[PDB]
């Protein structure tokens, strides 16, 4: 009975896989990108990448190939998951609906098999006779491809070689033929076999096993024309075919290891090569022809091309474009050119996609001091290293502040016919109209001719032919640019008000009720035209010249009262087309027609906060689809702002909201503001690219950040960050950081690039003398980072071969000072494990960093928390609890010894602790007795931890080794001396990410309990929350129901995916919930949604609003 809820706050950003080919159309170039459990499909174009389809999977993509057997229209996609979920996909567009369909699928694991060296490797023969797999040492699986085999049945074949490094099939081969470097004692070797599937056995390969080098690791299979195999090692590259043997040792590649490659030219003249260094190489094969004879090979060379991010994944695209998949850093779009610009680099970045990459540590801070957390993560490794500042919502910058308890509208207003700048904002008000002349950036309310001051304005548009409009309760009024006074005036033939006001800059359409007139602002006068009456009271109206119409506007829509409805109708005719018949007793406050790309838009706000959304037709006039959100309870006023090239839709609720554009879809991110009433684009000389926003009382004006549910602000560190503390009083951050250096010729160490520790503003080295006794080394720092500017204020450099592994920022003991404590460790490649390090206590001043105190220790200080004015601190195996002398020194009080190696600790307010490397977690107390440690309980499972957290006094989150999460609580039981020294694993769940850090924090606000965020190797930011047993239950059912309804991709079983799994063990998930899956609900059609019910009560659209009320947990 443990009840947690896990949700993705940020999908994985790292790139594990990318492949290219014609998946979409036989004529289309696709980039397939594998995230972890996300598959992105793109079309390659002139601009770069056209986003097409982003499907998710219930597994980690471990193999991703496109391939094409005979008589197949276009390419098919083969996907192997890491729980050995194999499956085949086809791209399938039903005209406008897109589907990725599973042509085949089966689970390919074997109970026998210890998974191997180089992990899963799945390859596919040129002729498409089959797929070959190396899941286990000794065996080699083969899934024969056929019309059938729809359940991917496969045999194994025993493999003499117990240690394969890499395999592929060879081109130009009568039989299927594999080629593989492999390691046994005397070095590595390259062997071959045919594959006769007729007989489920291997056949002497076309050519003798030879040798390849000690560090040989890639195998490339040069395409038909040349045929053969390329082998890459350190400093060396070699080529094999029968009795052919070319080979080079280009000093240039020795510098670092090649790591990923890509075939540039279909024929195989060229290949890209990735370095651990971020370096890009061209491998070129020099072809050779004889008259009537197939092409031989003369030579192979390596041309250094430049620098990319540390690449996992390379894919050559169109013309000099290269996609560059990175996990240690940002993935990027890259251009090769024939020439080398400044520096001599033939590489040029075109685009950069943000990868939170390895999130390694992180913390939560409301930097501006609001009540929303921003989140600050140490990311990347080596040069890609960085801080990333992550902020929910779209905020805006507040220029003036004029408290006006009323404002019931506002529109812009250039008082000069030329400039884009408006110096007025005539604001509808609580039954009046004040004008707002501006001295520039200065506020002033004066008169204006032919514009009322005692009569409430409903509009001010920007009507052409040198004039200014004012639709009032009463009459649509008129003022000129030349005349500027009385020009004309419309008035209803009865002495009767205008109810609903409209206008673009050419059209005028009003409404007396059902009455729908129509008038025009013709050169100096308002001439009348049409008239109609509708079933019911006109609630609201939208008109704007959209695409193929300057000024004068085509078709339309409207919402009336009693039927609660919105319907499609024309202009001078007013002819009714299709309609919707929305429900409830509350009317549509706002209707709007817009455009962005290739689709015209209709949206309709009701007074219950909620919105119904649809897509119209400049031509026809029909009915799109149907959904129902729930922005701010209060009615929503839809409008359009000036932003970039896809100028967007701002929605004014109690919960202000932007509506942007997704694929070509439309974003729904929060706007970071109190409450917005009405809003309009503006631009004076004194407030340009402004947006103007009235609230319960206040005019405001400002620009607008990105878009995304999340804004991410990065800080390039150029070395690899490791830990992160926010010491508030000093308005800065502490950041442990690590930079690499190479051995000199004076033997010492230099550096490979300026880092953030070398470009520090001030700086320090460790002077301390506590110890005595090409090539790479690591040099560690504490960085001091300004929270506002993100500048390395100060840098402290540690000893020689000292690694700083923990950072706290705390006051200690009586001491009113706020320290930065850093635990450290001396480390030598020889030694299995350091036997010495030191805790160091520092303070940062007006601008100074002083070594306030040190303290030797006989291990690695893996972690430390601030206990209670005491400093609790894992050392190597021991868990020690320090005290600050008033003399200001750290002195031992007690220690716990029973840990294989304490990697982690956390502290529940009271006197309670937790953590361990391999098995698993211990829970502890401090006893203000003899100030001892009593070891309360432990979990007795073999979990190699990576991250640990305390949810509450009893519940303990824990993440491990194998992408599982688990929760523990103490066994409330009789016989309290065994069943108490043991705490049971009550929540089990396969996340499918590797978790580095948990922390308490939340990214939202000014049903669930708490909020713990975690950050993963892949750039995923998730969140874990607690639940009520009842809420657990509803949701657990809702999950099971939700599955039957949902077709997974690859026909993977949701629960197979979510199941706890360490090689040696597989239970299903208990006590956990993916809201990720719950949230799936919303993306289900109302029928498939109904289904989900059949059954204190049971509804149909309650739940579709129970789900909403969760999405806003982040």
């Amino acid at each position: 009975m443990s009840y947690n809820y896990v949700v993705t706050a940020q999908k994985p950003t790292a790139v594990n896989g990318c492949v290219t080919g014609h998946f979409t159309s036989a004529e289309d170039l696709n980039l397939l990108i594998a995230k972890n459990t996300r598959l992105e499909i793109y079309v390659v174009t002139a601009e770069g990448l056209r986003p097409v389809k982003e499907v998710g999977m219930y597994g980690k993509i471990a193999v991703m190939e496109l391939f094409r057997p005979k008589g197949e229209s276009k390419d098919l996609l083969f996907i192997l998951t890491a729980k050995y979920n194999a499956c085949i996909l086809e791209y399938k567009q039903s005209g406008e609906s897109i589907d990725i369909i599973t042509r085949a699928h089966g689970n390919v694991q074997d109970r026998i098999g210890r998974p191997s060296e180089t992990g899963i490797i799945g390859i596919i023969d040129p002729e498409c006779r089959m797929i070959g797999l190396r899941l286990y040492d000794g065996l080699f699986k083969v899934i024969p491809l056929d019309r059938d085999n729809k359940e991917l049945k496969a045999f194994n074949i025993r493999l003499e070689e117990l240690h394969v490094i890499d395999v592929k099939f060879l081109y130009g081969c009568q039989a299927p033929t594999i080629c593989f470097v492999y390691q046994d004692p005397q070095g590595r070797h390259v062997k071959t076999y045919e594959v006769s599937l007729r007989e489920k056995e291997f056949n002497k390969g076309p050519w003798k096993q030879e040798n390849v080098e000690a560090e040989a690791s890639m195998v490339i299979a040069v395409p038909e024309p040349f045929g053969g195999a390329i082998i890459i090692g350190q400093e060396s590259i070699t080529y094999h075919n029968g009795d052919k043997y070319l080979a080079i040792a280009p000093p240039i590649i020795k510098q670092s290891t090649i790591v990923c490659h890509n075939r540039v030219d279909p024929n195989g003249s060229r290949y890209l090569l990735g370095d651990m260094e971020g370096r890009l190489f061209m491998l070129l094969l020099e072809k050779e022809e004889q008259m009537d004879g197939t092409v031989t090979l003369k030579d192979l060379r390596v041309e250094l091309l430049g620098e990319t991010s540390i690449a996992e994944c390379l894919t050559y695209l169109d013309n000099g474009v290269v996609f560059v998949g990175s996990r240690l850093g940002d993935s990027q779009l890259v251009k090769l050119n024939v020439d080398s610009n400044e520096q001599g680099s033939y590489v040029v970045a075109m685009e950069t996609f943000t990868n939170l990459g390895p999130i390694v540590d992180m913390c939560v801070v409301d930097l501006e001091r609001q009540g929303q957390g921003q989140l600050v993560t140490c990311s990347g490794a080596f040069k890609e290293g960085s801080l990333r500042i992550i902020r929910n919502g779209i905020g805006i910058h507040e220029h003036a502040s004029i408290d006006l308890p009323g404002i019931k509208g506002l529109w812009p207003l250039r008082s000069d016919p030329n400039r884009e700048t408006y110096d007025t904002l005539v604001l509808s008000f609580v039954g009046q109209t004040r004008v707002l002349m501006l001295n520039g950036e200065e506020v002033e309310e004066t008169e204006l001719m032919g514009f009322v001051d005692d009569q409430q304005t409903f509009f001010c548009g920007n009507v052409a032919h040198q004039q200014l409009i004012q639709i009032t309760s009463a009459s649509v009024r008129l003022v000129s640019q030349e005349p500027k006074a009385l020009v004309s005036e419309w008035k209803e033939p009865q002495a009767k008000n205008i109810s609903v006001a409209s206008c673009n800059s050419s059209q005028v359409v009003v409404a007396v009720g059902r009455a729908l007139y129509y008038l025009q602002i013709h050169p100096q006068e308002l001439r009348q035209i049409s008239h109609t009456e509708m079933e019911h009271e006109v609630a609201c109206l939208d008109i704007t010249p959209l695409g193929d119409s300057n000024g004068l506007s085509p078709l339309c829509a409207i919402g009336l009262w009693t039927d609660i409805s919105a319907r499609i109708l024309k202009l001078p005719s007013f002819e009714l087309l299709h309609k919707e018949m929305l429900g409830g007793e509350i009317i549509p406050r706002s209707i709007l027609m817009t455009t962005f790309e290739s689709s015209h838009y209709l949206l309709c706000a009701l007074g219950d906060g909620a919105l119904f959304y649809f897509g119209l037709n400049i031509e026809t006039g029909l009915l799109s689809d149907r959904k129902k959100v729930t922005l701010g309870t209060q009615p929503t006023v839809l409008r359009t702002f000036r932003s970039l090239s896809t100028t967007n839709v701002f929605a004014c609720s109690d919960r202000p909201t932007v509506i942007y554009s997704s694929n070509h879809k439309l974003v729904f991110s929060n706007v970071n503001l109190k409450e917005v009433n009405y809003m309009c684009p503006l631009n004076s000389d004194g407030y340009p690219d402004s947006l103007a926003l009235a609230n319960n009382s206040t005019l405001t004006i400002g620009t607008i950040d990105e878009i995304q549910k999340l804004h991410i602000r990065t800080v390039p560190l150029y070395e690899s960050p490791r830990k992160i503390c926010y010491q508030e009083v000093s308005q800065c951050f502490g950041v442990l950081s690590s930079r690499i250096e190479v051995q000199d010729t004076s033997g010492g160490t230099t550096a490979l690039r300026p880092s953030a520790s070398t470009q520090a503003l001030s700086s320090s080295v460790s002077s301390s003398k506590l110890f005595s006794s090409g090539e790479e080394v690591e040099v560690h720092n504490l960085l001091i980072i300004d929270q506002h500017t993100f500048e390395v204020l100060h840098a402290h450099q540690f000893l020689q071969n000292e690694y700083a592994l923990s950072l706290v920022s705390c006051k200690l003991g009586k001491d009113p000072n706020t320290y930065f404590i850093v635990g450290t460790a001396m480390v030598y490649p020889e030694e299995a494990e350091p036997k010495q390090g030191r805790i160091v206590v520092f303070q940062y001043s007006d601008g100074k960093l002083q070594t306030v105190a040190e303290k030797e220790v006989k291990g690695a200080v893996y972690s430390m928390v601030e206990f209670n004015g005491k400093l609790l601190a894992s050392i190597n195996s021991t868990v020690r609890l320090y005290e600050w002398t008033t003399e200001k020194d750290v002195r031992t009080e007690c220690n716990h010894y029973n840990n294989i190696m304490a990697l982690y600790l956390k502290t529940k307010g009271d006197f309670i602790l937790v953590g361990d490397l391999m098995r698993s977690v211990l829970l502890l107390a401090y006893k203000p007795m003899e100030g001892n440690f009593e070891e309360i309980a432990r979990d007795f499972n073999p979990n190699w931890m990576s991250a640990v957290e305390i949810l509450d006094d009893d519940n303990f989150l824990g993440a491990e080794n194998a992408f599982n999460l688990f929760v523990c609580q103490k066994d409330s039981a009789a016989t309290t001396d065994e069943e108490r020294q043991h705490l049971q694993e009550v929540g089990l769940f396969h996340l499918g990410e590797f978790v580095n850090v948990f922390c308490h924090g939340s990214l939202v606000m000014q049903p669930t309990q708490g909020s713990v965020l975690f950050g993963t190797v892949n750039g995923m930011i998730g969140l874990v929350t607690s639940l009520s047993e009842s809420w657990y239950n509803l949701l657990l059912d809702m999950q099971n129901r939700l599955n039957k309804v949902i077709k997974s991709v690859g026909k993977i079983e949701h629960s197979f995916w979510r199941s706890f799994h360490t090689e040696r063990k597989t239970e299903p998930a208990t006590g956990f919930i993916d809201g990720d899956l719950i949230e799936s609900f919303l993306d289900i059609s109302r029928p498939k949604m109904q289904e989900v019910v059949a059954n204190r009560e049971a509804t149909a659209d309650d739940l579709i609003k129970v789900v909403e009320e969760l999405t806003r947990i982040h």
Binding site: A14, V360, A381, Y803, V827, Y828, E833, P834, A860, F994
Partner: peptide, 13 residues
């Protein structure tokens, strides 16, 4: 050490 190793598993593979 296991430090080169924690730090390693740190970034990933």
């Amino acid at each position: 050490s296991l430090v080169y190793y924690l730090k390693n598993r740190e970034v990933r593979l």
